[PDB]
């Protein structure tokens, strides 16, 4: 299945090197804290954190933001473009306020993840790669997100909503559009990856310090 997103840039009035972008002073402090996590002479190691910070500030990554990151880090703009186009978490196009990312890999596909996707599509009236007319919600499919035992699940702006049902995801979307922030985590009454029937392990209080310590150690 084709992604539908191109990997070439055409200048537009809404996206061109003259688009105004610059880091806030707080973000410049964050950048200067980030850069010195790496040895001297290897400032290029901060490309991913600085680009992520730029995306967090601006909402997405224009070519002006890419050029600004390249100028700040003294790295080639083509290298910045390579990183931005390689990594899929970077938005090179404007997205909605809430970026729903439904995981559709096999462990999530075995459970009714297609039901979750269809419920989202009917609730918002958009396709699997479109954005709501009020620029409020964007819906995409993604690969495994690391919460397979809590399938099916979605990610909406670095928050995991797990053990979902169509009613649960519809309620989450309603809460998001109302203004409230839903609590991330499983929606089936579980707190974490524990079995739903009951704890089959770690049922007794943990042993204290120095429990099975070696003689010499």
């Amino acid at each position: 299945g084709a992604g539908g997103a191109l990997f070439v840039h055409r200048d537009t009035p809404e996206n061109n090197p003259d688009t105004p972008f610059d880091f806030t002073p707080e973000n410049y402090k964050r950048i200067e804290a980030i850069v010195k996590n790496y040895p001297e002479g290897h400032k290029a190691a901060a490309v991913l954190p600085v680009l992520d910070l730029a995306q967090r500030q601006n909402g997405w990554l224009p070519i002006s933001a890419m050029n600004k990151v390249a100028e700040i880090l003294q790295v080639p703009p083509m290298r910045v473009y390579e990183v931005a186009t390689f990594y899929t978490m970077y938005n090179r196009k404007p997205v909605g306020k809430y970026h729903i990312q439904v995981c559709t890999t096999t462990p999530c596909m075995l459970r009714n993840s297609d039901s979750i996707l269809e419920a989202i599509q009917k609730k918002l009236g958009i396709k699997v790669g479109e954005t709501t007319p009020d620029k409020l919600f964007t819906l995409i499919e993604v690969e495994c997100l690391g919460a397979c035992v809590n399938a099916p699940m979605v990610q909406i702006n670095d928050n995991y909503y797990e053990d979902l049902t169509p009613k649960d995801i519809e309620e989450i979307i309603d809460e998001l559009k109302a203004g409230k922030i839903p609590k991330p985590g499983p929606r089936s009454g579980r707190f974490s990856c524990e079995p739903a029937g009951g704890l089959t392990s770690l049922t007794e209080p943990p042993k204290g310090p120095g429990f099975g310590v070696q003689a010499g150690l």
Partner: protein, 230 residues
Amino acid sequence: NLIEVFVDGQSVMVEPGTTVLQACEKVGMQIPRFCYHERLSVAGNCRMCLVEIEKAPKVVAACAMPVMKGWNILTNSEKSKKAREGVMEFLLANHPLDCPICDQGGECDLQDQSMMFGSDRSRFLEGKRAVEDKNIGPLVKTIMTRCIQCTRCIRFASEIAGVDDLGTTGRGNDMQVGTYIEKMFMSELSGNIIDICPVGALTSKPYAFTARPWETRKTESIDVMDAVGS
């Protein structure tokens, strides 16, 4: 001091750090390649140079694997031949049918190495990939559907010409080579990417369609446009 390696059982003394490709070159065997250039850095991505070591269950990239003492390199073994055939099969599976309309024509490394090391038949029953063409100036014509993503132009551009405007955007089968922006790769050493590109993706624009390699007569002279004496 020199270490003794073996190519097809023939002894050869090579300096430490010498590669399998260079050992075969010393014994007179040119291992097939698409991404390896001796003037450029080692990439090891086209995977065309895979050869078999006598006791190694796994094939090694001859362009990037330093030889060890007492290594026997089986250049014409069944595993090496099958590896070359598979790599060429992938290359031609995604390559386009442009040979007659392509200026690379009879001087193409893909054609020659397909005739010498690859199979004579295709098992690809799917559709092919078509790539949008870029524009990097009035000298180099780009038809990027023929690119095999060998990164010779990128490495040459950066290392030799000191210009870092070539690279790969995207990933996977959709990985593309270009500038990602409408930028002309203008430099005094821009035609050497035409030379080093093994395929017709990068071709001379002034020379386009004019002739074919077998017709041309070669006159070995020198250059007068400057005082280097090229």
